[PDB]
Homo-oligomer: A and B are copies of this chain.
């Protein structure tokens, strides 16, 4: 029966049947957004949902026999497994993000369809070359996030009161969003020199960020 199913799994029909379901389950998840729609045809799509969930575990079960060990070494497959596992956790108990994390199965459209995998792979591949920089920034953020918590956190605890808060605020300054009117002109009503902290921070952080892009335009 092995080759019987190895022929079912590898079939164009099977793979296109899966893809057909993703675009259907995606269309159905956009409709579950409408509180109106849910009042009318709610039970339909709650069932239609659970149906697809079964179908998908059946496939992943079928797909595992055909591949065994090879499957739990395939990034795209590992994903598909974990993205379905989330969708099996009872619609209750634990955390309720789990109900919401269910929309992640629509990322199977990236998995099930090539060109997409290509494009995703193309993107992902750029990451190892960046880890040296990324390592650098996180060190850098960490260092300033500490200075900031202990330099500004007493008077301005919303923004800098906690290590985590500083991270967030520094990040915000890094995206350069409302950094002056929002954070530093305020800080300067109390700490006139706060500009001496944040302008150098902005330069260094924006510089590094430019360099990193130039690097991705050389690989």
Contacts and interface: CB of A to CB of B under 8 A. Distances in A.
A20 interface: no
A106 B216 contact: no
Contact of A175 (B179, B211, B216): B179
Contacts of A147: 100, 103
Quickly give the copy total for this chain: 4
A136 interface: yes
Task: Give the interface residue-count category, chain A.
Answer: 35 or more
A211 B104 contact: no
Centre residue among A34, A107, A207 by max chain B CB count within 10 A: A207
A104 B208 contact: no
Interface stretch (A43-51, A55-63, A68-76, A110-118): A110-118
A32 to B, nearest CB: 8
A33 interface: yes
Contact of A182 (B162, B181, B217): B181
A182 to B, nearest CB: 5
Nearest to A101: B147
Nearest to A180: B172
Given A97-B151, A116-B132, A133-B119, A175 B202 contact: yes
Interface in A85-112: 97, 99-100, 103-104, 106-107, 109-110
A10 interface: no
A214 interface: yes
A215 to B, nearest CB: 9
Given A30-B163, A33-B162, A116-B132, A103 B146 contact: yes
Given A177-B177, A179-B175, A107 B143 contact: yes
A34 B165 CA distance: 12
Interface in A17-62: 26, 29-30, 32-34
5 contacts: A30-B142, A107-B143, A123-B207, A175-B176, A213-B213
